[PDB]
Write a protein that binds this ligand. Structure first.
Ligand SMILES: Cc1cc2c3c(c1)[C@H](CC(C)C)NC(=O)[C@H](CC(C)C)NP(=O)([O-])C[C@H](CC2)O3
Ligand SMILES: [Ca+2]
Ligand SMILES: [Ca+2]
Ligand SMILES: [Ca+2]
Ligand SMILES: [Ca+2]
Ligand SMILES: [Zn+2]
Length: 316
């Protein structure tokens, strides 16, 4: 759409008010021209045909409940774009300012969110297991990072490589949640999962086993569902990433925490320079150690901690 850039205001899934970047051409659209080649949000109108209609509103106010998931998908995608640019100097997902697109209101009672190879897609949840998925900044950032990974390392979605792909999306989703300072934690999806129960989440990075996911290589799932356990075995890498950041003693192995910034710099470097489509856990460890080496020196404490953390989770 060609028009005039403006700013509208509305309310997100959790009922918080925010300003969002819109475009005006007869209607006001959810089109943000301030970021790269644009962020565009579409209505899939409960259907599965994509992308759907670019979102149009008559008065630049988005307070209807039907509007909530679109406000958030649009705003959170902006924040996520900002994180990548400000922290890692990367322009959008392909590093060349590609337009970021999302569709909300996909299907009926859809309890998931995903990246379809070209755009993000968000279900509204059935209202018991989930509420509209774009209300979780860690979820939106998990989705856009799959795009980042696909354009860089290209980790195949299965077995070990696939679990690394999933963990990268949880790690960066989590780093974005802290960047935005939105009540941050080391849990995934807490804000949109089981509105009826407080205190739970889909997965935990600080203690994966809390929901039955492995937290040590010896406990890796070796079966075939979930493409070989991509959302299960990610627990082992997420625990490693949590220890490199925060520190702790896990299975008798102590790790000194180096903090979140460094965690983010080391994994982004591993992802963008060293990993490949078929990389396995062991190769991820070599990548992470080399990245930390590049950045802080071989005899650094940073290198030391990346090593300790992998040892703690059993990855050699
Ligand atoms: C078993 C399975 C398969 C696929 C999934 C997911 C699980 C997982 C389902 C949710 C836990 C309910 N999806 C994800 O973890 C994320 C969404 C979270 C809310 C962050 N979606 P993905 O982008 O990983 C898409 C896949 C596809 C297949 O989700
Ligand atoms: Ca309106
Ligand atoms: Ca949180
Ligand atoms: Ca979280
Ligand atoms: Ca809950
Ligand atoms: Zn994922």
């Amino acid at each position: 759409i060609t028009g005039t850039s403006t700013v509208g205001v509305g309310r997100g899934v959790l009922g918080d008010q925010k300003n969002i970047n819109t475009t005006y051409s007869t209607y006001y659209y959810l089109q943000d021209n301030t970021r790269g080649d644009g962020i565009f949000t579409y209505d899939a109108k409960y259907r599965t045909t994509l992308p759907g209609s670019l979102w149009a509103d008559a008065d630049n106010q988005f307070f209807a409940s039907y509007d909530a998931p679109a406000v958030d998908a649009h705003y959170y995608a902006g924040v996520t774009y900002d994180y990548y640019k400000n922290v890692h100097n990367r322009l959008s997902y392909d590093g060349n300012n590609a337009a970021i697109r999302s569709s909300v209101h996909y299907s009926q009672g859809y309890n998931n969110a995903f990246w379809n190879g070209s755009e993000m897609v968000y279900g509204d949840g059935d209202g018991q297991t989930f509420i509209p998925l774009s209300g979780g900044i860690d979820v939106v950032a998990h989705e856009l990072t799959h795009a980042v990974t696909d354009y860089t390392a290209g980790l195949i979605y299965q077995n070990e490589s696939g679990a690394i792909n999933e963990a990268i999306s949880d790690i960066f989703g989590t780093l974005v949640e802290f960047y935005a300072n939105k009540n941050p934690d080391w849990e995934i999806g807490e804000d949109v999962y089981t509105p009826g129960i407080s205190g739970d989440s889909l997965r935990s990075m600080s203690d994966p086993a809390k929901y039955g996911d492995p937290d040590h290589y010896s406990k890796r799932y070796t079966g075939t569902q979930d493409n070989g356990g991509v959302h299960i075995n990610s627990g082992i890498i997420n625990k490693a990433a949590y220890l490199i950041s925060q520190g702790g003693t896990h299975y008798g192995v102590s790790v000194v925490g180096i903090g979140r910034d460094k965690l983010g710099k080391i994994f982004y470097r591993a992802l963008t320079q060293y990993l490949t489509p078929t990389s396995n856990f062991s190769q991820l460890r070599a990548a992470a150690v080399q990245s930390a080496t590049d950045l802080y020196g071989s005899t650094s404490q940073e290198v030391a901690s990346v090593k300790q953390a992998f040892d703690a989770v059993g990855v050699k």
